[PDB]
Amino acid sequence: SRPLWLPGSTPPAHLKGDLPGDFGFDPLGLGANAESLKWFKESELVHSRWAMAAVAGILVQEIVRPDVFWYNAGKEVESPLGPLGLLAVEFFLMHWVEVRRWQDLRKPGSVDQDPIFSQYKLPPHEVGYPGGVFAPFIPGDLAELKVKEIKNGRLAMLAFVGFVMAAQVTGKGPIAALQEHLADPWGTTIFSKAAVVPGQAVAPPCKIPASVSYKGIEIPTPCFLQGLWP
């Protein structure tokens, strides 16, 4: 009745199309339990929203600041606030924001009131979709917008993982890697730099240094599951 990930298939019973982006994909049945789906619904939005912001940032960094490698931005960046000064602000600010979001997930409608200012309050909303101050402007229908958000978000989540493995294998940024593909599309695919057959296995070398020296300490920098690479 609705488009599915695999056309012609029957969606699992626990999936019925109520949620946005519900295309009936759940081969392992992780969403069968009602409470588990409610939690997994929140994490998908949060993961997607973080990924979209992260993917956009990495692309903008390369265009604006081509010299700096987004992978090495952790050590490359220098600021007066120092390493632990930045971390301290980040921890406390994130702890407040995340706990309040977490509380609404458990008991919705309890953390809508603004603590400091009495008059301001968050209108009634659904879990994971705060309204009011967070949404000053809405281009159009929310139902359509929610589908747009998740579909772009899901793509972004894959996009970021593409950056990491491309960065670890090719040792380059996202746009820089793409330019390499366009130069020699046949000789740059993962098939054209790695292969495993009975009796032999060839894998790309991890182009990220094993360890990083950062202000008198050594930070391990391992390639993700480098032993299982093709």
Binding site: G29, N33, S36, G199, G227, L228
Partner: protein, 213 residues
């Protein structure tokens, strides 16, 4: 009706197919008594679950050794970890038995008196230790994703999958030990040799398994 380990042989009376992975294999009638069968059903799962962790760990580290990442073989990891990290073996052993003793004693008295560990005695937890079946704790701690609380049909399918991968893992862990004793090389070192010349490199030619060879 249902398949059995020895086609054509009727299954034993005490094995009625209700349990997961039941193929009517009990030639020595070790589980004829119903109460003793409960004990062995859980013993098999604990053996199978540990073997799966052991086999996966041995395989993964062996891949690390072959690829050159520097992992030691499973039969040398214990010595390497202790020496490299400067760990007192007797202290590490004692810590293990405190943590295993506490966790495994709780599993022991849940078998004797089911539901006894969910009385709130342990830090006030009253529902995470209740238990679903014999050998299947369930709950939001041991089953955080609630795959045992969703579809009933698929949960029974997983029980079939768990036991058979567990039995396969148990056999594999015996293979690792037997192969090391006969060959003295790592798991994947043996696999590489077999793929090189399968005809002339196997157990029938190692000079140990078949002494009359």
């Amino acid at each position: 009706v249902r398949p059995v380990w020895f086609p054509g042989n009727p299954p034993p009376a005490h094995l009625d197919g209700s349990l997961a992975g039941d193929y009517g294999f009990d030639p020595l009638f070790l589980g004829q008594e119903p109460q003793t069968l409960k004990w062995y059903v859980q013993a098999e799962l604990v053996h199978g679950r540990f073997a799966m962790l052991g086999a996966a760990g041995i395989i993964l580290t062996s891949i690390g050794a072959k690829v050159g990442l520097g992992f030691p073989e499973w039969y040398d990891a214990g010595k390497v970890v202790v020496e490299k990290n400067n760990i007192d073996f007797p202290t590490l052993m004692v810590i293990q038995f405190y943590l295993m003793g506490w966790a495994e004693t709780k599993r022991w008295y849940d078998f004797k008196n089911p539901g006894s560990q969910a009385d709130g005695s342990f830090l006030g937890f009253t529902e995470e230790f209740k238990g679903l079946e014999n050998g299947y704790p369930g709950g939001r701690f041991f089953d955080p994703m609630g795959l045992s609380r969703g579809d009933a049909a698929k949960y029974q399918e997983y029980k079939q999958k768990e036991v058979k991968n567990g039995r396969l893992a148990m056999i594999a862990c015996l293979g690792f030990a037997a192969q090391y004793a006969a060959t003295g090389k790592g798991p994947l070192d043996n696999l590489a040799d077999h793929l090189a010349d399968p005809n002339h490199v196997n157990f029938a030619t190692n000079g140990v398994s078949i002494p009359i060879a």
